[PDB]
Amino acid sequence: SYAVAGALQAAVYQQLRADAVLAALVGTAVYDAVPPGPLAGTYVSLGPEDVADASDKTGAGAVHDFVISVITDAAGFATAKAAAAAVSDALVGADLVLSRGRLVGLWFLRAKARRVEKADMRRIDLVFRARVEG
Amino acid sequence: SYAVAGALQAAVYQQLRADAVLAALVGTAVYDAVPPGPLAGTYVSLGPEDVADASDKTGAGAVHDFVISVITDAAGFATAKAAAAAVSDALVGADLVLSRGRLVGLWFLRAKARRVEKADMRRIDLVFRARVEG
Amino acid sequence: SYAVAGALQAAVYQQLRADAVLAALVGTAVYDAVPPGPLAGTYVSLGPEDVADASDKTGAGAVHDFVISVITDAAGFATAKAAAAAVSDALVGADLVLSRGRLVGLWFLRAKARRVEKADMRRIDLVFRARVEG
Amino acid sequence: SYAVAGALQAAVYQQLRADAVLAALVGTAVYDAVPPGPLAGTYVSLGPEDVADASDKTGAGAVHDFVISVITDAAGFATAKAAAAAVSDALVGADLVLSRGRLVGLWFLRAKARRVEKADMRRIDLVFRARVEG
Amino acid sequence: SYAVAGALQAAVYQQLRADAVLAALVGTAVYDAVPPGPLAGTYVSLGPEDVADASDKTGAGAVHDFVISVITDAAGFATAKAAAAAVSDALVGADLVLSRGRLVGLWFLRAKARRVEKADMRRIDLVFRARVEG
Amino acid sequence: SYAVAGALQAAVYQQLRADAVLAALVGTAVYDAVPPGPLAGTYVSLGPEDVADASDKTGAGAVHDFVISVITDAAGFATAKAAAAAVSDALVGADLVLSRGRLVGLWFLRAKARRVEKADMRRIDLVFRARVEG
Amino acid sequence: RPRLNRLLVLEEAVRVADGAGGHRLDWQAKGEVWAEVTAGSGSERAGEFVTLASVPFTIVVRAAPVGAARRPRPEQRFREGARIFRILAVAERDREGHYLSCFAREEVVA
Amino acid sequence: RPRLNRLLVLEEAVRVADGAGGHRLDWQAKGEVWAEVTAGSGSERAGEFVTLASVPFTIVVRAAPVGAARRPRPEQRFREGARIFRILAVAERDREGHYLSCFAREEVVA
Amino acid sequence: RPRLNRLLVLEEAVRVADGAGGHRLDWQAKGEVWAEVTAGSGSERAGEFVTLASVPFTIVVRAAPVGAARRPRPEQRFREGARIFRILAVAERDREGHYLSCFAREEVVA
Amino acid sequence: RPRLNRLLVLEEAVRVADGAGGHRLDWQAKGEVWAEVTAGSGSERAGEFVTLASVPFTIVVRAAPVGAARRPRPEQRFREGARIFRILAVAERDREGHYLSCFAREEVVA
Amino acid sequence: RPRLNRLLVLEEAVRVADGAGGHRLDWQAKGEVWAEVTAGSGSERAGEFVTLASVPFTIVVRAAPVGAARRPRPEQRFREGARIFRILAVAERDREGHYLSCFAREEVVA
Amino acid sequence: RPRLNRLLVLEEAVRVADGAGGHRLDWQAKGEVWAEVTAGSGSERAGEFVTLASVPFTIVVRAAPVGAARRPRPEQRFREGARIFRILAVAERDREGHYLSCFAREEVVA
C-alpha cells in the first residue's frame, strides 16, 4: 500500500457502524478481523484492497480499489442485496476525513454477487474506488 | 450491489411466475433459494448478478448483468431451450416497476449453454443487462 | 438462449441424419442425448451453444456459435476429419427452415481438433455461427 | 474441420516419411496413431489441428494451424531440434497436392519447445499454418 | 536478471533496516532469506523481481518491477498497512547508490493486499518500478 | 523449431562455459541435460525455447525467445542474481557464429525471478530474443 | 452373503425422442426387487445452484443374465417410495455370480 | 450398537418466503432427541473471510419412517446449547433399520 | 490362488493403416481364455458428452512367455458376449509366474 | 485412555480492537494444563515466503463444560516453553466425555 | 525376506555429451542381477500423445556399498528381454541392509 | 522401540549474511548421531529442470531438551557419506520422550 491506505481502511470502517441502516440489518457484524465465537452469519468484511499509484511531480496520490464483501447464510440473498444497498449509500459521496493525507472522491465500481462455498454462503463483493492524496 | 439491485431481483422474480408460459413448462420451480425436498429437476435459478456503475454528476445508476440459469435433468436439452425461450421473452422489453429507483431498459446478452456436472445436468445461462437508475 | 434456439437445434439436428454421407460414416449416431447401450464410438454430438444477441429497435435477433463435436475411438483420426467434412458441407449455406423465426445464414468458425481423454478419444469441435431472427 | 482437412493431414503425413532426412533421425516413427509396442522414443506426432475459416462469397477456404510435435527421451534435446529442423524444411514451401481441394501455401508459426512430463520427455511443438481452398 | 539487479536488491535491502520507522513496527524482520527459529510473524520479504529491458544503442538499462511483500499474523491488517506505509515512503524518491550501474528513479506501482493462507496470514504485495542503467 | 535453433542452442551453450565469470560462480554446472549425481545446487539450464517465424519472400528467418533459467539452493538469492549478471553480459551483443544460418542480434527480454518449489529453490528465468536467419 | 431385506422398485424410463436429437424420460415402473442397501460416508455436495446431500449406498440385488428384465442397468434407477436411488454401475459381487453390486446416490436437495 | 448418551435439540426452520424468490430462516426448535456423537479428524478450513474450525461428527439417532417428525432431514440442524451441528445426510446404519447416521460439521469461527 | 471360472474372448485388432498416419481397427477374435473377474468400486465418470459407467475389474488369466498368443497385451481387449473389457496392463500376480493381472474398465454408456 | 504426561500452558489472547475493524493480540497466559501430545506425519509446507515445518500433533486434555476456563477453544493456543502449538478444533474423544481432542500444528520456520 | 527368483539385466548408459549441453544415451549392459518383482495396481496413463500402460513394480535386489557396480542407481534401468523397467529410487529395505527397493514403471505404449 | 544401527553426521550450517538480506550456507559438521532410517514409498518427482528421485526416510534419533546440540532442528541435515538427508520436522515418537522422528528426503538427481 501507499501511505494513505492505513487510514483509508480506518475511515471506511468508521463510516460503517455509524450508518443508521445496517446497524439494524447486519448489526455490530462489521469487521476485518472476524472475532471468535459462533459466526453470526450476515456479516460484512473489509480487507482486500489494491492500489494503483495516481501520482505526479509534486507529491503523490493513489487509487484504492478496495473490496467490501457482504456474506449471508440466508436461504435467498435479497438479505445481502439489502445489506449492500446499505453499504454503498454510506460510502459513495463519502466526505470522509483521513488521519494521513486526503481523499478526493469515493466512487463505486464492479460488484460481483455469486454463490461461494457449497452453494450455501452467498457473498456479494463491492469494489469501491478511492482516489486519495498523500 | 448498488441501491437498486435489492429490488431488481425482486422485480425480475415477480415478472417470472406470472408469465403464462413457463408456468406450464417449469411450473412453480422458479427460485433463488432452492427449497428442500426431492429436487424437481427442470428448475430455473436467479442469483449471480454483477454491477458496473453507470453513474453521473447528478445521482447514480448501474448496469446489472444478472444471470438467470435454466437447469434440466432431461435426456436432451431442447427442454431447457424451450424453457429459456419462455424466460427471455418475459424479460426483454420489460416495463417493470421497481421498489427503489427506476430501470430504463432490460436487454439481453451472452447465453452460454453447456453440460455441467458428469454430463448429466444441462445448464443454460442467460445474461441479461439491466440499466437501472438510483 | 433467445426464442429461436429451441428450433435452431431442432433444425440443425434434422439437417443431419438426412445428409446422405455421414449416414454411411457415422450412421444413426447423431445425438444430443446419448442413448444407453454399448457406446458405438464414432458419434457426433450437438449441444454446447452460446448466444450473442444481434438485435435492433424493431424486433430481435441472435448469433448462435453452437458447437458440433465429432468423437471417434479410432486409432488415427482421419475418421473424424472425414466425418466432420460430412458435417460441415451439410450446414454451411444451410437454407434451413425453423419453427419459430428465421435464420439468415449459417457460417463456419473455429474448429479445434485435439486428443481428449487419456490420449484415446479424439474429439474435433466445430463452431458454427447461426445469425437468426426472432 | 472443413472439407479439406481430411486430406490435408493425409498430405502432410505423406510429405513426411518421404523426406530423406528424418528417415535417418526419427526413422519410421512418424504417426498420428502410435502403434503398440515398446515406444521407440524419438517419434513425431501429427494430430492437433484447428481451423479458422478464411472464406468468401464464391466457395470457401480455411486456415489450418495444425501442430506437429516432436517428442524425444534423450538427455538433452538437441536431438529434437535437429529432428524438427528436418520437419520444418520439408513443409515450408510445400507444393503439396491434396485429395479434395487445394492449398495455396504452407507457412510456419509459433514453435514452443519445453519439458513436458516429470522433466524427462522433451516435446517441441511446431504450429504450421495451411491456407487451403475447398 | 540484467547486470544491475544483483546490486538493486542489495540497495533496496540496505535502504530498509536503516529507515527509522519500521525498525519500531517490524523490527529486524526484513529479509529475503527467512532465518530459522520461531517465525516472528510481522516480517517483510524482498525477492520476487521481474525485468523488462529498457535499453538503447549505447549501453543498456532495465525496468525492475520488484515485489516487496508485508506479511502479518495479526487479527486485522491495519498492522501491515501501517508497515507498508513505512515501506513505501522509504523507497519512492529513493536517491539510492548502487554497486554496479545507476538507477534513475524508483517509483511505485500496483499493491494488491489480500488474505493468503487459510484466512489467517495477511499479505500485502508492493510492486515498485526501478528503472536502472547498466 | 525452424532450421537454425538446433545450432542456436549449441552456440549459446558454447558461449557459456567459456565466459570467465560464471566459471567461478556456477562452475561446470551449465547444462540442458542435468547429469546424474548429487545435484550441485547452483546450476543454470538452457532448454525452453519458442519460435515466432520472422520470414520473408526470399528465404526465412526466426525469432527465438529462448529461456535460460538460473537455479540456486542458497538462503537468499543474491547468488542467482550475481550468476545471471554473468549470464546476460555474456549473451547481449553476442557476435556468435552458428552452424546453420546466421543470427543478426541477441537481445534481452523479460526476466521473472521468483521462488519455485516449497519456498526453497530460487529460480530466475531469463528470456533472450535471438533473431536468426536461415 | 447379503441379507436382502428391503424392497425397491426397479424403474426403466421409456425414451420417447423429441425433435432436436434428445429424448424424453417418464420413468414407468418395472418390477419390484428385494435388495440390501449399505450406506457409505455421506456429505454435502456443491450442486448446480443447490446444496445436495449425497450418500454412496451400494445396493445388492440378485443376478440374472444380461438379456433379462431382472438385471438393473445403469440407465435405470431404484425407488423406495419417493427416495430415488440412481444406478451408477452393476458389478457382479460373488465369484459364482449370485448377486450384483448396484451403486446409488440418493441426493436430496437439503 | 450405539450408546445414545447425549441430548440434542432437533431444529427445523420454517421457511417464510421473501419477495425475491428466496426464503427466511428462523430455526424454531423441534423435539429433543438422544444421540451419540463421534468426532472425526478436525482441522481448520478456509472460510469466506473467516478461519473456521470444523469436525466431522457422525451423529447416530434412532430411526423413523420418512413421514415422521423424528426423522432428521438434511435441511435441519442439531443444537446442544449453542453448538450448531448441521446435518449433511441421513443414511440408515443398521441392516434392520433401527438407527440413522447424521453427519454434522460444528464449525466455530476460531 | 484364483478360481478361473468365467470364459472371456481375447481380441486382437489387426491394424490396417490409412493414409493420414493412423490405423483402422476391426477387432477379430483371438482364442478364448478362462479368467476370474473381480470388480472394484464402480461409479459414473464424465465422458466426452456421455455419462459413462465404469468399474475396475481386475482380471486374472493364466500366464505365458511374452512371445505367445496366450499373453494378453494392453492393446487387446476381452469380450464376454457384448461386454467389452479393455486391458490396461498385465502384471504377473504370483511369485512363480503362474497367473497375470489384467485390468479392465467395462464402461457402458448408462 | 490417555496418559497425560506433558505440561502445556493454555494461552488466550485478549483482543484489543484497533481503529480499522481488526484486533490486537498479545497472548497472555491462562492456566497450565496437562496433556499428551501425539505426533502425526510431519513434512515441510510452502508458507508465504517461508519453508515451514509442520506436524499434526493431536493433543488430549481433560474436558470441561463449555462455559469454563479449562476448555481450550480454537482461538487459543498451547505453549511448551517456546513451542507454539495452535488449536484447530476440540472434539470430545470419549463416549462419556472425559477427554478432548485438541489439534495443533507447531510449525517452526526451518 | 525376498525370494530372488527373476533375472534382470542392469543397464547403465554411458553419457556422451553433444554440442548443445545435453548428453547421448546408448544403454550398454552392466552385469546381471537376480531380483523379485512385485506388481502394484496398474492402469493407463495419459502420455504425451500415447496411451501408456504403467505398473508400479517394486524390485528387490541385494545390496552393496554405494561405490560399487552392484548398486542400481536411479539413472539406470533394468531389462528382462525387451521389458524396460526404469529405476525411480533405491531405498534399503531391511534394518541390517541386506536388500534394496528398486521402483520401476514398465510402461508399454498399449 | 528403535534399533539405532546407522551412523549419521548431523550438520548445522552457519549462516553468514550477505548484502541483499539473504544468508550464505557452508554446512560444517556437528556431532555424529546414531539413528535408524526407515524408507517409505519412493518415486520420481518433477524438479525444476531435473528429474529428482525422492524417498520419505523417517529417521529416529535419541532425544534431548530443545536447548541442546543433540536435537536435530529442521534447518539442519544428515549426511551418511555423500547422501544428504534433509530434515523436515522433529516430532517426539515415544510417550516418555526417549526418541524423535526426523523426516528426510534424500533426493538424488537421477
From TrEMBL, chains A, B, C, D, E, F:
InterPro entries, sorted: Gp17-like (IPR021508), Viral_Tail_Comp_sf (IPR053745)
Pfam family, one: Tail_completion_gp17
Superkingdom in the source lineage: Bacteria
Protein name: DUF3168 domain-containing protein
Organism field: Rhodobacter capsulatus (strain ATCC BAA-309 / NBRC 16581 / SB1003)
Automatic annotation (TrEMBL), chains G, H, I, J, K, L:
Top-level lineage group: Bacteria
Protein name, entry field: Head-tail adaptor protein
